[PDB]
Design a protein around this ligand. Sequence first.
Ligand SMILES: O=C(Nc1cncc2ccccc12)[C@@H]1CN(S(=O)(=O)c2ncc[nH]2)Cc2ccc(Cl)cc21
Ligand SMILES: O=C(Nc1cncc2ccccc12)[C@@H]1CN(S(=O)(=O)c2ncc[nH]2)Cc2ccc(Cl)cc21
Ligand SMILES: [Cl-]
Lengths: 302, 305
Amino acid sequence: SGFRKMAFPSGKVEGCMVQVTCGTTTLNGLWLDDVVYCPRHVICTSEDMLNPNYEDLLIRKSNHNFLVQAGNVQLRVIGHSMQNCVLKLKVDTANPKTPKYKFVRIQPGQTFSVLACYNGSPSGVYQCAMRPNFTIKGSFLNGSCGSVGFNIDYDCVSFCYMHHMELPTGVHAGTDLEGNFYGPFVDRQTAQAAGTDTTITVNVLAWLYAAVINGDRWFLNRFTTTLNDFNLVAMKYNYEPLTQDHVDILGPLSAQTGIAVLDMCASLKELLQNGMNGRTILGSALLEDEFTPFDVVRQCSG
Amino acid sequence: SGFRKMAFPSGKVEGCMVQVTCGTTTLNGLWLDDVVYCPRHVICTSEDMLNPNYEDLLIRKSNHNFLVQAGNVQLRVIGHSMQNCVLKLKVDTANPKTPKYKFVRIQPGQTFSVLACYNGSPSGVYQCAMRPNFTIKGSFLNGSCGSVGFNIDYDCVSFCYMHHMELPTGVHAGTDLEGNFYGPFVDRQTAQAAGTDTTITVNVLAWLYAAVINGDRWFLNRFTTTLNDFNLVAMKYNYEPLTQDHVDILGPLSAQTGIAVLDMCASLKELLQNGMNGRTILGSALLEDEFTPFDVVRQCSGVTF
Ligand SMILES: O=C(Nc1cncc2ccccc12)[C@@H]1CN(S(=O)(=O)c2ncc[nH]2)Cc2ccc(Cl)cc21
Ligand SMILES: O=C(Nc1cncc2ccccc12)[C@@H]1CN(S(=O)(=O)c2ncc[nH]2)Cc2ccc(Cl)cc21
Ligand SMILES: [Cl-]
């Protein structure tokens, strides 16, 4: 019993964190085999922030301009290349602590763990979700750039995010490990704003199924809804549309608890109308949307 | 910016997790140097768990009855002893991944990270607080026994908790690494219930300071209060009494934000009597009490390990 926001054990990722210095800028890098991955904005001089020409700034660099530090050991850079918004620094030592890994690009609503780092040193681990507006509500300070997001299903680490910047509203933007940004963002200090954020409907439903599995049934009702009627109500509360894929995904949880997806949808419609009336669901007074259907099956059933 | 429930990096602890099997029971052990620590209830059976004489049960067991598995390697047990509610299994191999460590006993209100394991394999890390009633609101299933709680200070791991059981309300009970239970609990199948819980006042105040640091100021007011008047209000809402030590501890946060501790207490008093009125603080509609004043400073400064 119990339901906590849980992060993956960070050990396999801690053994990959290094410090990357170029000029006056110091940020984090991810050392896998003989390559160190880091945000390409490590080559920028702040005056190269409104309109940097990264190809022009990178052509002027040599291998010895990048100082890479793994613990108390300096790594020698023997090559460098840019792939989208990530800089790939070839080094002369393969990381002996390199775990089994993959680079995965995630979709909004997906969750992952973040190992927040400063000067190549891990300071904390927390659970996150990719918001529908492609931002992440993280906990980051200056020097956290290059900190990574990951999932560890089995013994394989799937790297899905690399932190690049903070938006004016306090939310964070970044890329996958191939350098492609999530959302309409660019690694430039230009006027950029996160789009209006919405609640991840499929995740709230999964969390209501976790509450039922843990014995909380107070919010259930005798009603059902059509998918169309639910979406017309949901849109008015800034909830993401629920698709037939989401309904299919919730199938195992519906079978385990005996509550049809569209019946659980009718309970959510009512919770949005009534509020909680001083009550809580799984220790929360708000509807939680950072647990996916997969997270619920993993944490509630092993 | 941002304020998340954050746990310590778990790597130094992952390298210590092993599986311990005795008879039909499998749970987790902590391998430090040449000793494996685990709950003593790993030696219990069906009727033994009802009313157990653990010295009588341990005498019947020999070293080869304890199967210890570190990854895909079996460790050989060369001795065994009991210290309070923890079993200490002497092994032939010293853990080469043993970090710098200490065994510390924590006080209610203090927080720690828990590395939840099943069959000696870590599956998750989460942050939590020792409740004033000595329970933890954790997330555990069968096989999680022996999972540990810890804090990291520079490069030293302070082990403070070992999971032993789940109470009927879904909350958890365990011991420090010396086998002493937190709370009035015993390690056996019997009628046990967690006492009435209270809110950790110093932690709520620290979390209100974190909200101010992150730009949330709506709850602030022009008023201040006395420590006595605040505690008379706090006792009414099942909040732990706030001591002069708590006030002293919140000092750095008071200086950084310009909000005196009794000035923030007046904000907390108004919040308890009037509610949030549809508003949230750091994305929460409830008053959060699982961040200590040190957690707030550490997260709002970027301390690394
Ligand atoms: O924002 C960034 N990184 C951070 C990362 N995470 C959380 C932060 C919290 C607080 C401060 C920074 C944070 C960096 C640096 N900043 S900055 O601080 O405004 C700055 N301007 C001049 C020197 N430093 C501009 C910027 C612009 C574009 C890009 Cl791609 C990265 C970045
Ligand atoms: O509760 C305990 N551990 C657990 C640990 N964490 C979360 C659990 C969730 C769900 C089930 C157990 C959980 C154990 C197990 N049992 S039990 O459920 O009745 C049981 N009987 C046979 C197998 N399992 C009571 C018990 C009594 C005394 C002691 Cl010290 C430990 C314990
Ligand atoms: Cl995905």
